[PDB]
Design a protein around this ligand. Structure first.
Ligand SMILES: NC(=O)c1ccc[n+]([C@@H]2O[C@H](COP(=O)([O-])OP(=O)(O)OC[C@H]3O[C@@H](n4cnc5c(N)ncnc54)[C@H](O)[C@@H]3O)[C@@H](O)[C@H]2O)c1
Ligand SMILES: NC(=O)c1ccc[n+]([C@@H]2O[C@H](COP(=O)([O-])OP(=O)(O)OC[C@H]3O[C@@H](n4cnc5c(N)ncnc54)[C@H](O)[C@@H]3O)[C@@H](O)[C@H]2O)c1
Ligand SMILES: O=C(O)c1ccc(NS(=O)(=O)c2ccc(Cl)c(Cl)c2)c2ncccc12
Ligand SMILES: O=C(O)c1ccc(NS(=O)(=O)c2ccc(Cl)c(Cl)c2)c2ncccc12
Lengths: 280, 260
């Protein structure tokens, strides 16, 4: 541990020095006039992402099972100057999503930015979880991503223009005890974004971008406490910056991309390779 | 290249301790063919008691016939491992006829290769049901006895897909990423709970010539034979290896991939 701590310290110094050389102005795009669909926008990350998009002069479409919350979000987005359309949609229900997309096309148009934010969690050890909760976790956290993307993606492919934002979590990269189904569904969300990015690239679709939001514990009341001993508005600012600069893997806070490559390289020769493989 | 030469040296010069799985009750899902079938043969040589599961009745019986020629005691069950009800009822049968399973190999899996807009919702759901949801119900059913006896082994057969994406396999890659996640969190939760006796392994092979899919996604000229992956998995289980890559050297390539 004495020589291992000093090897990781020298690693982190040169990693935050490489990201500082490449740091020269990344181009910020305009999302003004774009049709943005935000799922789970009735509170937290979704609600504040909607406010960020409202300031950005985007056309908003807000989805959520909570009718009151989504209307409260739309009211404040309209105060910001944006046009907003709210839909009470269960984003874990394939039928509901497909029918609601028919409504969105009729009342608003063809969605150009999709933010798969809606999510659920039922904290418990595996043998205390209920099957009903496990299935519901997968339905909202990943299966729903498939049906909404499948519905909205044809028009994006037609116009060679779109952005699929997958709100996952640090959970999609590292496990957490007592959150097995949730971590699994979040790992599936990272996978979905990953394979989608490679399939879009393989198909030659140059105009559809992808982003993956992986924040640590956020004070939104989603869960009562963090697993290891971050404000909602900060994560919204981090996500909007990522989207506007076409960042594929957005970590909140950014420096967590480093902590993740500190557990994965945790034999002595595993960190040893990550040294000379990086400084070139 | 250099790490694989050093890993070959460590494997012989300082061999990791092998444990005995003789007399252990091993349940292998999707044992009617491929990785599952050859894992069953490896466990049969290891003198384990086998419970083989699969939707293919003929194939699972053909596998049992060979495990019995190898000297092992085998019980087969036609179980749909994507069906929660079927799994729960079949575990009641296993406990009545065989006993408390001590090693679980979640190997059953499905795949329907297609670009996102050509996939069918029926196939996407079925991919999740067999490749990850099924892992939850079988583990949830078999775990209570392992926790009681502080002794067990949960083997999750995932894929390189669970670490890196592949075009035209989005639902499959997503379900495999979920399998890696399930294994990782299971490991940490067992550790957090103080359960020292239940081990976990994750099998992540590259393309294996089992007819699961027609061709590999990338130019892999020395293709993986089915019997090799079975040998790699048995070595991993006997040495309590948590993340088993087939071939082993993919661990440095995937760790290396995560830059710029
Ligand atoms: N809050 C965290 O600790 C944290 C950290 C990392 C990732 N995340 C992810 O961020 C996302 C948002 O979490 P949050 O903190 O904003 O939660 P939140 O509780 O503040 O709000 C989530 C919103 O999703 C809605 N929602 C839930 N189920 C839905 C369904 N079936 N259909 C439609 N809408 C539904 C809720 O009504 C709510 O308005 C989730 O995907 C979560 O996994 C959260
Ligand atoms: N073969 C590969 O190239 C490859 C590579 C890496 C990982 N994998 C994984 O390895 C595992 C085995 O693949 P394989 O190549 O041996 O496959 P295979 O085609 O040889 O046979 C898999 C078996 O699973 C059974 N099965 C499918 N659905 C089932 C269900 N609902 N209930 C019970 N049994 C069911 C099938 O009947 C079949 O006998 C899968 O989980 C797959 O994801 C495959
Ligand atoms: O809802 C969530 O996604 C969520 C995200 C992060 C949590 N924990 S954390 O921030 O301490 C953390 C930091 C680093 C890593 Cl590597 C990891 Cl895995 C975890 C957390 N904890 C409890 C309930 C939900 C969550
Ligand atoms: O069925 C599978 O799991 C499977 C596993 C691997 C495949 N491709 S591969 O071996 O070329 C390869 C090598 C390295 C990496 Cl990193 C990756 Cl992602 C992929 C593959 N291809 C087509 C259909 C199924 C599979």
């Amino acid at each position: 541990i004495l020589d291992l701590l000093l090897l990781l310290l020298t690693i982190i110094y040169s990693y935050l020095e490489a990201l500082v050389k490449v740091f020269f102005p990344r181009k910020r795009k305009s999302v003004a006039g774009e049709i943005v669909l935000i799922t789970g926008a009735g509170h937290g990350i979704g609600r504040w992402t909607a406010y960020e998009f409202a300031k950005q002069k985007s056309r908003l479409v807000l989805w959520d099972i909570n009718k009151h919350g989504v209307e409260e979000t739309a009211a404040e987005c309209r105060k910001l100057g944006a046009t907003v359309h709210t839909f009470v949609v269960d984003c874990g229900n394939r039928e509901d999503i497909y029918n609601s997309v028919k409504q969105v096309k009729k009342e608003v148009g063809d969605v150009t930015i999709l933010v798969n934010n809606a999510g659920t969690v039922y904290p418990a050890d595996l043998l205390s979880t209920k099957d009903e909760e496990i299935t519901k976790t997968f339905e909202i956290n990943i299966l729903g991503h498939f049906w909404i993307t499948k519905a909205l993606l044809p028009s994006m492919i037609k116009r060679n223009h779109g952005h699929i934002v997958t709100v996952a979590s640090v959970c999609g990269h590292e496990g957490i005890p007592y959150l097995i189904p949730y971590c699994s569904s979040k790992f599936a969300a990272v996978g979905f974004h990953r394979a989608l990015t490679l399939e879009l690239q393989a198909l030659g679709i140059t105009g559809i971008k992808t982003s993956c939001l992986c924040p640590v514990f956020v004070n939104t009341g989603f869960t009562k406490n963090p697993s290891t001993r971050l404000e909602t508005d900060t994560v919204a600012r981090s996500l909007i910056d990522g989207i506007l600069t076409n960042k594929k893997m957005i970590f909140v806070p950014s420096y967590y991309n480093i902590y993740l490559i500190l557990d994965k390289f945790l034999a002595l020769a595993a960190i040893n390779h990550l040294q000379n493989i990086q400084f070139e």
